[PDB]
Amino acid sequence: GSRRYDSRTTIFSPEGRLYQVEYALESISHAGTAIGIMASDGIVLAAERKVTSTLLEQDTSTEKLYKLNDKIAVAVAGLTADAEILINTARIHAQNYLKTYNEDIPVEILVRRLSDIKQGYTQHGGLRPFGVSFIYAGYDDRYGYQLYTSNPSGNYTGWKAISVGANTSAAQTLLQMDYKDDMKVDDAIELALKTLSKTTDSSALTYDRLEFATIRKGANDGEVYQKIFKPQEIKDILVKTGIT
């Protein structure tokens, strides 16, 4: 019967590893690097688009940074199509929570939900897992600014600074070296771009190969503003920090 052709996506190896999760992580390691850095007065999201073209319409393009609600955003590393499935689900969960409690969803709760969905694909159903790793950047009135990451296993962790995708080993060492607790957004912006500039496989880091975003309380009085940087704005911050 059909059993003959079943890959058995949800099994343990003799060593106690989930094959498909491990291979999905290997897929993600070839994806464009994405970096998240949390500061006392905001969060930075930086990410590298993969070997682009001059004919790509960048200003209408989105492959790395997505908005979940007004307070929470994500940086993607892996299969973009897989990520959009999960992103739409996350967007709906946030709206469900808002409708039920009349309050914006706490960042961790949203992250846990998505991470639980990923987990399900590793334990039951016989389907391949989502080849996606997220960096969640968000704010709520309980914990303030938060950074999380989730991977195909459905495991999530909180961070002060973190990278996903390609060259994470190199990137994480560089972040661990220059990161400090009393750091600010403008400093974090610089750290993020400097790290990408060193870990990139490209010859040089340019505006057309980047997606950039910030979550700031730099919004008029006690409230939070998301800023998805435009191509021209990424070009300006690259000059400001002294990379181009």
Partner: protein, 204 residues
């Protein structure tokens, strides 16, 4: 017994020159018993305003529903919803409950951000769109509101004149209805400024 007249209340909307106005009373009751004088019936999603009369639980539910939907719309479309589009969304959403409807009388009001054209629309409890040029009425004193609006209203009123006309339409209509009143609110809406005024009225 009649769900549309347990809680009571009214909403009215009017067009003016490069402006729209939408107003509502503040009463919520349990038939004869007045319960709340702070129950506002007008909500807004971006620059689109929605007034809802009828059964209060559904008023609340639909607000939460249209907030839900307009929020997702914005995330995907990367722009705020327009009055014409929202009107179609309200109609769609109501008609999907054709044989188990929300007992409400919605009213949409706003200005199209691109064309600048003023827009109002009314609905029955199941989705039928009444897209009037002049005015829209809804609630337990809709008959009274029709009479007031039909006599008081004239086209191309300026924002501060329109305020007087709609306020007097609401106030005098509410004063002939036992289940309406207990306060009132009027929204004056222009392309990039909105003023909200609470009216002084008789509290019986």
């Amino acid at each position: 017994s009649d769900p549309s007249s347990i809680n009571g209340g009214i909403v009215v909307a009017m067009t003016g020159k490069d402006c729209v106005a939408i107003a509502c009373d503040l009463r919520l009751g349990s038939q004869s018993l007045g319960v709340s004088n702070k129950f506002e019936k007008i909500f807004h999603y971006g620059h689109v305003f929605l007034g809802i009369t009828g059964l209060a639980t559904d008023v609340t539910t639909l607000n939460e529903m249209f907030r839900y939907k307009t929020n997702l719309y914005k995330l995907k479309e990367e722009r705020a919803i327009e009055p014409e589009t929202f009107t179609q969304l309200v109609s769609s959403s109501l008609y999907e409950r054709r044989f188990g409807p929300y007992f409400v009388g919605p009213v949409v009001a706003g200005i199209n951000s691109k064309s600048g054209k003023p827009f109002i629309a009314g609905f029955d409890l199941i989705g039928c769109i009444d897209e009037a040029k002049d005015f829209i009425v809804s609630g337990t004193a809709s008959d009274q509101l029709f009479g007031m609006c039909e006599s008081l209203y004239e086209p191309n009123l300026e924002p501060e004149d329109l305020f007087e006309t709609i306020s007097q339409a609401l106030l005098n209509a509410a004063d002939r209805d036992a289940l309406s009143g207990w306060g009132a609110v009027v929204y004056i809406i222009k392309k990039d400024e909105v003023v909200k005024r609470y009216l002084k009225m008789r509290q019986d």
